[PDB]
Short mmCIF file of C-alpha atoms and ligand atoms in Angstrom, two decimals:
data_model
loop_
_atom_site.label_atom_id
_atom_site.label_comp_id
_atom_site.label_asym_id
_atom_site.label_seq_id
_atom_site.Cartn_x
_atom_site.Cartn_y
_atom_site.Cartn_z
CA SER A 1 -4.06 23.85 -53.10
CA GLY A 2 -4.61 20.45 -52.67
CA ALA A 3 -3.89 17.01 -50.60
CA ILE A 4 -3.88 13.45 -50.35
CA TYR A 5 -5.97 11.92 -47.13
CA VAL A 6 -4.79 8.33 -46.26
CA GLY A 7 -5.83 6.69 -43.30
CA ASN A 8 -5.17 9.23 -40.44
CA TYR A 9 -2.58 11.07 -42.58
CA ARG A 10 -3.06 14.45 -44.63
CA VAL A 11 -0.09 14.87 -47.71
CA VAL A 12 0.50 18.33 -48.54
CA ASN A 13 3.37 20.41 -50.58
CA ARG A 14 5.76 21.23 -47.54
CA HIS A 15 5.59 24.79 -48.81
CA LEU A 16 2.07 25.42 -48.43
CA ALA A 17 1.57 23.47 -45.32
CA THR A 18 -0.97 25.74 -42.68
CA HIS A 19 -0.33 26.19 -38.32
CA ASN A 20 -2.41 22.79 -37.94
CA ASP A 21 -0.05 20.76 -40.34
CA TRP A 22 2.76 21.49 -38.37
CA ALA A 23 1.62 21.60 -34.55
CA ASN A 24 0.47 17.87 -35.84
CA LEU A 25 3.55 17.10 -37.94
CA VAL A 26 4.43 13.16 -38.42
CA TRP A 27 7.39 13.89 -41.41
CA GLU A 28 8.55 16.41 -43.48
CA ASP A 29 11.25 16.69 -46.10
CA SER A 30 12.33 20.03 -48.05
CA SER A 31 14.18 18.51 -50.52
CA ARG A 32 11.02 16.58 -51.73
CA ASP A 33 8.48 19.84 -51.04
CA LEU A 34 6.37 17.31 -48.86
CA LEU A 35 4.93 17.40 -45.45
CA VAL A 36 2.64 14.82 -43.73
CA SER A 37 0.33 15.81 -40.89
CA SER A 38 -2.06 13.51 -38.69
CA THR A 39 -5.79 13.83 -38.77
CA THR A 40 -8.61 12.62 -36.42
CA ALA A 41 -10.76 11.57 -39.62
CA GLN A 42 -10.38 8.61 -41.72
CA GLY A 43 -8.61 9.21 -45.16
CA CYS A 44 -10.55 7.40 -48.52
CA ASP A 45 -7.68 7.83 -51.10
CA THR A 46 -5.61 4.80 -51.92
CA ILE A 47 -1.88 5.22 -52.86
CA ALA A 48 -0.01 3.39 -56.05
CA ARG A 49 2.54 1.30 -55.20
CA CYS A 50 3.53 0.83 -59.24
CA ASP A 51 6.00 2.16 -61.66
CA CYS A 52 3.74 3.83 -63.91
CA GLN A 53 4.79 6.77 -66.06
CA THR A 54 1.27 7.63 -67.49
CA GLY A 55 -1.66 9.04 -65.61
CA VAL A 56 -4.25 11.85 -64.99
CA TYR A 57 -3.81 14.93 -63.23
CA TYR A 58 -5.99 17.56 -61.99
CA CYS A 59 -5.60 21.09 -62.98
CA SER A 60 -6.85 23.95 -60.86
CA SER A 61 -5.99 26.74 -63.44
CA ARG A 62 -7.71 25.20 -65.98
CA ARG A 63 -10.77 23.27 -63.68
CA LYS A 64 -9.97 20.06 -65.86
CA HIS A 65 -7.92 16.89 -66.06
CA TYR A 66 -5.26 15.89 -68.12
CA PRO A 67 -3.79 12.47 -69.14
CA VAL A 68 0.20 13.14 -69.27
CA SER A 69 3.48 10.79 -69.59
CA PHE A 70 5.69 11.61 -66.78
CA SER A 71 9.48 10.73 -66.23
CA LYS A 72 10.96 8.37 -63.22
CA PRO A 73 11.26 10.11 -59.71
CA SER A 74 14.85 12.19 -59.94
CA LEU A 75 16.81 14.80 -58.79
CA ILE A 76 15.85 17.97 -60.72
CA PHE A 77 16.82 21.50 -60.28
CA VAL A 78 14.32 24.11 -59.20
CA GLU A 79 14.63 27.73 -59.19
CA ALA A 80 14.68 30.14 -55.96
CA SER A 81 11.23 31.05 -54.60
CA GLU A 82 9.86 32.85 -51.49
CA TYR A 83 9.46 29.29 -50.20
CA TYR A 84 12.89 27.93 -51.10
CA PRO A 85 16.34 28.86 -52.43
CA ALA A 86 18.04 27.27 -55.94
CA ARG A 87 18.09 23.65 -55.07
CA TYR A 88 17.77 20.10 -56.34
CA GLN A 89 14.59 18.67 -55.53
CA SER A 90 14.20 14.75 -55.21
CA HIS A 91 11.57 12.25 -56.04
CA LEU A 92 10.50 14.49 -58.84
CA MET A 93 8.44 13.65 -61.85
CA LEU A 94 8.00 15.93 -65.11
CA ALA A 95 5.63 15.95 -68.04
CA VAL A 96 4.34 17.94 -70.60
CA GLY A 97 1.64 19.57 -69.18
CA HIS A 98 0.16 23.16 -68.44
CA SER A 99 0.51 24.41 -64.90
CA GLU A 100 0.71 27.64 -63.17
CA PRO A 101 1.20 29.14 -59.61
CA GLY A 102 -1.68 28.00 -57.82
CA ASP A 103 -1.69 24.66 -59.29
CA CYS A 104 0.49 23.24 -56.40
CA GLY A 105 -1.56 20.27 -54.68
CA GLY A 106 -3.52 18.64 -57.73
CA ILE A 107 -3.18 14.86 -57.51
CA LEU A 108 -1.87 12.53 -59.99
CA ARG A 109 -3.08 9.33 -60.32
CA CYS A 110 -2.96 6.11 -62.59
CA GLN A 111 -4.83 2.91 -62.68
CA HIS A 112 -3.34 1.68 -59.24
CA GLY A 113 -4.14 5.00 -57.44
CA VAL A 114 -2.70 8.31 -56.21
CA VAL A 115 0.75 8.96 -57.61
CA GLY A 116 1.91 11.97 -56.26
CA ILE A 117 1.18 15.71 -56.07
CA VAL A 118 1.89 18.94 -58.45
CA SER A 119 5.04 20.60 -56.95
CA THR A 120 6.84 22.55 -59.64
CA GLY A 121 5.72 24.08 -63.40
CA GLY A 122 6.23 26.20 -66.04
CA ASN A 123 7.32 26.28 -69.87
CA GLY A 124 4.60 23.59 -70.94
CA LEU A 125 6.10 21.53 -68.25
CA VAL A 126 4.58 20.67 -64.92
CA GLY A 127 6.29 18.33 -62.02
CA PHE A 128 4.86 15.91 -59.24
CA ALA A 129 6.24 15.10 -56.06
CA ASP A 130 5.95 11.14 -55.73
CA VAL A 131 4.62 9.37 -52.86
CA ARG A 132 4.71 5.67 -54.17
CA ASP A 133 7.64 4.90 -51.93
CA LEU A 134 6.45 6.41 -48.78
CA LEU A 135 4.40 2.54 -47.78
CA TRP A 136 3.98 3.62 -44.19
CA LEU A 137 1.10 5.74 -45.51
CA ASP A 138 -1.03 2.44 -45.47
CA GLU A 139 0.57 0.99 -42.53
N1 LIG B 1 10.15 24.39 -54.92
C1 LIG B 1 8.82 24.03 -55.43
O1 LIG B 1 8.64 22.62 -55.32
C2 LIG B 1 8.05 25.17 -55.91
C3 LIG B 1 7.73 26.19 -54.64
C4 LIG B 1 6.91 27.24 -55.31
C5 LIG B 1 7.26 28.02 -56.51
N2 LIG B 1 7.89 26.82 -57.76
C6 LIG B 1 7.20 26.67 -58.98
O2 LIG B 1 7.51 25.96 -59.83
C7 LIG B 1 6.31 27.74 -59.38
C8 LIG B 1 7.30 29.06 -60.14
C9 LIG B 1 6.63 29.43 -61.05
O3 LIG B 1 6.32 28.94 -62.15
C10 LIG B 1 5.31 27.95 -61.56
C11 LIG B 1 4.20 27.52 -62.67
C12 LIG B 1 3.26 26.16 -62.19
C13 LIG B 1 3.73 25.59 -60.89
CL1 LIG B 1 2.54 24.37 -60.09
C14 LIG B 1 4.76 26.22 -60.21
C15 LIG B 1 5.22 27.03 -60.14
C16 LIG B 1 8.57 25.83 -57.04
ZN1 ZN B 2 0.13 2.75 -61.67
#
């Protein structure tokens, strides 16, 4: 579990969105596993607007932060699950690192701010759903 709170927006994994998220829906994309809902309180997170390929992510299954090198956002095949059929997920970045089911929602950050959230993982890999191209999160 985990979310990005920026301005009047809350960014979460689409497969983990609540009834409230859907009732206050701004935008959602199954192909990216992202959902953005509206909030009344103001959000304190800063979003990075960069092309960094290094950063630090929070891993709840280890209660620790880990430094990672990660790939550029791309279309990567993701196995079937209770949430989705087998498909290509877009804007996804992979890194060599630990992750387990339950780690989705962990934030990835570089020196510029929030880069994305854990969305996939397994086999010593961890996948992050990028949010740097969503320029409208700030305005
Ligand atoms: N379609 C997706 O983005 C997700 C939906 C939930 C399920 N997905 C995963 O990748 C699961 C499958 C099992 O192994 C792991 C290990 C670590 C992590 Cl962070 C996630 C998973 C795909
Ligand atoms: Zn950066």
